Amino acid sequence: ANPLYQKHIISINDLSRDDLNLVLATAAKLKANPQPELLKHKVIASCFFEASTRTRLSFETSMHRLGASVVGFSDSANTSLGKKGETLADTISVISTYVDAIVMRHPQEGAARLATEFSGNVPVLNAGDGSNQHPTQTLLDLFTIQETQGRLDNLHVAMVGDLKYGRTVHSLTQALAKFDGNRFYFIAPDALAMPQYILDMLDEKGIAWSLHSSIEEVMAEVDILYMTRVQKERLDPSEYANVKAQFVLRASDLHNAKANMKVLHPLPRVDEIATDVDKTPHAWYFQQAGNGIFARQALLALVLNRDLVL
Amino acid sequence: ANPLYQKHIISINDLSRDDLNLVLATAAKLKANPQPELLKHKVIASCFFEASTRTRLSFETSMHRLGASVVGFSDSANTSLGKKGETLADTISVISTYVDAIVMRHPQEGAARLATEFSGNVPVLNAGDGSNQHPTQTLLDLFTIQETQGRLDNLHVAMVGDLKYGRTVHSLTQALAKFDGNRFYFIAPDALAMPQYILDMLDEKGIAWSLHSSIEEVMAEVDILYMTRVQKERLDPSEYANVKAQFVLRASDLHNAKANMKVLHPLPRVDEIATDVDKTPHAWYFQQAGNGIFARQALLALVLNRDLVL
Amino acid sequence: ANPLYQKHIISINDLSRDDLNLVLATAAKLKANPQPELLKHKVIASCFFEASTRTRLSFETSMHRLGASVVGFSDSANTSLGKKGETLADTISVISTYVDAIVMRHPQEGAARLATEFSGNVPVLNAGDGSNQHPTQTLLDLFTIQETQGRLDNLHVAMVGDLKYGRTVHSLTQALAKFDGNRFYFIAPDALAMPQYILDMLDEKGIAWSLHSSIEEVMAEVDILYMTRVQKERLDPSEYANVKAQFVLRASDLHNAKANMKVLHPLPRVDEIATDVDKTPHAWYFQQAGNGIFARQALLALVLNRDLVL
Amino acid sequence: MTHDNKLQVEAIKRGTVIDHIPAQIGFKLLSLFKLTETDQRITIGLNLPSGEMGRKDLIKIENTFLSEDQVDQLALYAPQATVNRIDNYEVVGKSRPSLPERIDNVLVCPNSNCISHAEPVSSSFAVRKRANDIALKCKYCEKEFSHNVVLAN
Amino acid sequence: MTHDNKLQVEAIKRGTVIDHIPAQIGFKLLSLFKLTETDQRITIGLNLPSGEMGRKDLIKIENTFLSEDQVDQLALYAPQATVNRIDNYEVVGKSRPSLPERIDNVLVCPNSNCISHAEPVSSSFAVRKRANDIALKCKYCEKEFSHNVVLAN
Numbered sequence A, B, C: 001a002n003p004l005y006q007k008h009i010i011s012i013n014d015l016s017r018d019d020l021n022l023v024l025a026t027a028a029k030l031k032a033n034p035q036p037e038l039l040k041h042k043v044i045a046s047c048f049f050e051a052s053t054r055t056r057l058s059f060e061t062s063m064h065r066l067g068a069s070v071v072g073f074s075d076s077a078n079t080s081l082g083k084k085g086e087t088l089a090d091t092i093s094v095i096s097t098y099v100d101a102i103v104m105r106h107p108q109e110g111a112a113r114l115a116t117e118f119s120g121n122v123p124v125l126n127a128g129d130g131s132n133q134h135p136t137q138t139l140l141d142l143f144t145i146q147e148t149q150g151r152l153d154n155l156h157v158a159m160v161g162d163l164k165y166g167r168t169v170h171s172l173t174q175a176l177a178k179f180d181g182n183r184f185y186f187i188a189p190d191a192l193a194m195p196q197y198i199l200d201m202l203d204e205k206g207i208a209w210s211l212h213s214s215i216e217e218v219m220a221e222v223d224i225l226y227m228t229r230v231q232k233e234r235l236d237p238s239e240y241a242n243v244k245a246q247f248v249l250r251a252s253d254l255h256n257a258k259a260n261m262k263v264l265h266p267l268p269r270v271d272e273i274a275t276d277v278d279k280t281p282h283a284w285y286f287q288q289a290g291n292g293i294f295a296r297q298a299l300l301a302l303v304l305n306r307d308l309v310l
Numbered sequence D, E: 001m002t003h004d005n006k007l008q009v010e011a012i013k014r015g016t017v018i019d020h021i022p023a024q025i026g027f028k029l030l031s032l033f034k035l036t037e038t039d040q041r042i043t044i045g046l047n048l049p050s051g052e053m054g055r056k057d058l059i060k061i062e063n064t065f066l067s068e069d070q071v072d073q074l075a076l077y078a079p080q081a082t083v084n085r086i087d088n089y090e091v092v093g094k095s096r097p098s099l100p101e102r103i104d105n106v107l108v109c110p111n112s113n114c115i116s117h118a119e120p121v122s123s124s125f126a127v128r129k130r131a132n133d134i135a136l137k138c139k140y141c142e143k144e145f146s147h148n149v150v151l152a153n
């Protein structure tokens, strides 16, 4: 039994470095040598109570690539939770008596953690719990960063945009902070800054981090430029001034960008990255998404398969 | 014929110090000796295409106090301008063939002005045109200020809150600027700072003005503390960060205030003046509103009655 | 100065039998001999923050019949209280500096009483305060009962329908209870029963009252059959079963009805009274509403005029 | 003023002492009447041995004097209570609560639609002695409530 | 035993004595801990002169020990408070409340979008010391706040 067998993937905060590396090493193995029937007789629930394109499709595609079946919903408007008023607890109590695993994305934070208390030995994978965590997204980012930078330590990482409601940066920052000598450049408007708990944590580990008002400033030192979208669906009325993109990346802003540097971005983009960047060698958000298939195949394999992949 | 006979009252910028004092002079006479029949056979249109409680009621009350009749609307949803798509020009082309005077408040700036180009010798009185001008509000203010301070020259006046959209402070500022040695203190959030045109105008006349980040700073020098509400209905999406009052006046903040000081405020207030202030001798916004009656009566009498009031 | 000069008219509970008789005595006088210029230089506010057809129009008509002017609003949607978030205390604080009296109808109970706390010496008249009281309606009803019954004592009055949320029946029961020998018959659903504070009040005075399941039971004893509409706009979600009229009076149910009996009804009706009743000699709800003019003229006259009507 | 007794309370001058508070009521008066929002020394004894009441609560507040209207408010929750005013250790005054006509700015109208809420005014109720409870009539909405249901704040 | 030596509050037989409670905090603990919901004798002293602090609150409850009544929690509202277990009129046990790793049930997560609200679960926060401002991390939403934002909810 590998370390991740039958474990809940809820928060990066609960995962070790050995766990993350375990996932990436597995993704590479499966990417190199596919295993079409690894999960042959498994049925997995794909429960999206919140909108999604890349996460649900890649996850569901990953499952099929491993031979497992998928059931679920991509809108809590057809479930008895919305059309008949039901608690997440009751919904999980029943679904967990049907399936072998539950991948879930929820609008409220804590949903995945709440879910584990109601799914007796049926693994729960957090596909994002409203602005809090997004573990798998980080596994995919780790994989990609490694693929293009050759490593996960001693890197200059900049995260731009909505960092307060960005569940992706919360996980990513915590994960990269588990490795040695990484430096963070946070570029986001005041009203949407990086939560104190992430900063305090960085300090406790002696990790170096700094704030900046523009991308140009850090553009020549960054190995990874992680752009993000403003979480308009999680903003409070008194923050609607930030709904628009304050930081826009254009093909020209990359003239003095390191050769190796790669631009990433959990894809739902709304002009934070001008399409003219797509053509440059630095654009890497579409290949990033593609890495979702490998990171997620490895995760499912480790969670639902006791013996490590050969 | 007095000087304002049949004149349009659109912007304070078009009135002279003479005109202002004329109105105040008349306002004092009518207050002391009412004239129930001065406008006996006049029919006035009270046209409000935008919300109003104080301005529309005191105006209409003033008309009845002088014996005139009133017609109109307080909502442009019943008029054929909204329920049938109609231009303000047309709405005025017809209404001006029915009444002797037109009092109007509109959501767009310039409405009052535009109106004068379509009301053949029927005088138009601006009751507020968007975030631009509010002439009669100023008259009420000057009356109140002269009443409580004994003069309109050499005063220390502070204006707090939304100054960018406050049509009241624009008018009041331009009007006080017509008198000698007045000093201004603007206490507003960067996003809602006093327009540049007002400031350049104060400069051109050698008027002294300073910006301040708190009321405590100026609380010892001011004679008039003029509070204003955030004009939420006029804010741009990118300014919703300001919708909440950034400066709240409480009764404790008045400990070092000059004995003669008076707190004024057009009125719809919303948490920027604690109600515990109402009990203090400095609160004077309700009385301020009471004077709306004398200021508006005078204005109507001077505009529609040829001979000066005895 | 007559007893009701400059007095607030809030709740029947606060008026005496003398006061009532005075209003009725005055209403009769003015009805016999109109006085078109009694309130000649008065301006009254007609403030309805809730719907009304009868009360507001009859009140304003009564004002005109006495020569007073009217300003106000029939919908709190155009006022700054709604379009700008404003407390009633502030609304009354400014309106009371314009007018000679305020007639108000409000959705929340206690509204009128609160108003009296913010209108220094300007009388406040309750035109209805969200399911609590309706003083004027009662005066109208008493006038009607005395006109058709010859008296207000030793009558058999039955009240059908929504007695819980029927502000009209709360006021009418309390007033009739100020007269000798009246007997009440309350016919209403269990969920919409007459308030306990009303029953306790009747018990304290030794007034006889009893409940009944139908109109047929009492039809032959009643002198006044007071029908009411179900106050749907005030019912709670758990009472919507009562929204429909459970007791419906039809022309045929009046066969064993006392010759003198009259069917009364505040006027908004929704099938509680079949239109075939309109033609019977017992139908008296329209002439009842008609009496609203004389009751209200008298009320305005006594409150705003020091000398009793000749 | 006590020496030859078995009681464990002693030494207090110039203040107020509310006695014979029925058990489980001393804490309610304390919170319900904001009696502990002061800088003055307070001494409370809950479930103290009582000759007749069996058990009783006891509140002492130095340098504070409840008026006649305040002492009467206690009658809504502790009718049997006894109040003594103190000074220089001398218990100059002694009195008893008597049910008031009104009780202002203390309770909150249970009515969700009562105007008194989102408004610049303090609550107020007419007090009416009823059987088994006390009826409170909101001065605004005029609805009557059981004193066992009307909350504080 | 313990007699009076210029200290007007020293007498009880077996129970708990919570000392050094900061002013205006003694009434809170009485509430949160539902300490008065009992038939046992309780003595409370508010605004007591403290040569130790300046002005302190003091509580004494007979035949009642607060070990499962969470000294844990008490560590939050009254960090400097001291808890002594009494017996035979003498202090047999004395201790300082120590900050817990967590707190369950009592608190409520400030986060209005936290899943904890609409669901059948008990609250839980991980306690962590910063600088005269304890931070609390919600078990579910993982968001963190200050005890001053959570406790003064």
Ligand SMILES: O=C(O)C[C@H](NC(=O)CP(=O)(O)O)C(=O)O
Residues within 6 Å of the ligand: A051, A052, A053, A054, A055, A056, A128, A134, A137, A167, A168, A228, A229, A230, A265, A266, A267, A268, A269
């Ligand atoms: O990048 C974003 O704006 C949102 C982010 N997006 C994704 O993970 C991709 P998707 O929503 O298609 O699954 C998330 O928080 O889930």
Ligand SMILES: O=C(O)C[C@H](NC(=O)CP(=O)(O)O)C(=O)O
Residues within 6 Å of the ligand: B051, B052, B053, B054, B055, B056, B128, B134, B137, B166, B167, B168, B228, B229, B230, B231, B266, B267, B268, C080
């Ligand atoms: O509404 C304000 O904040 C200020 C000012 N207010 C008024 O004139 C009072 P009202 O809107 O009730 O007529 C305005 O510009 O309309």
Ligand SMILES: O=C(O)C[C@H](NC(=O)CP(=O)(O)O)C(=O)O
Residues within 6 Å of the ligand: C051, C052, C053, C054, C055, C056, C128, C134, C137, C166, C167, C168, C228, C229, C230, C231, C266, C267, C268
């Ligand atoms: O509406 C009812 O059923 C009774 C009563 N009706 C009236 O006053 C008539 P109106 O609403 O037209 O003024 C009321 O309480 O408002």
Ligand SMILES: [Zn+2]
Residues within 6 Å of the ligand: C110, D109, D110, D111, D114, D115, D116, D138, D139, D140, D141, D142, D143
């Ligand atoms: Zn009430």
Ligand SMILES: [Zn+2]
Residues within 6 Å of the ligand: A110, E109, E110, E111, E114, E115, E116, E138, E139, E140, E141, E142, E143
């Ligand atoms: Zn939470």
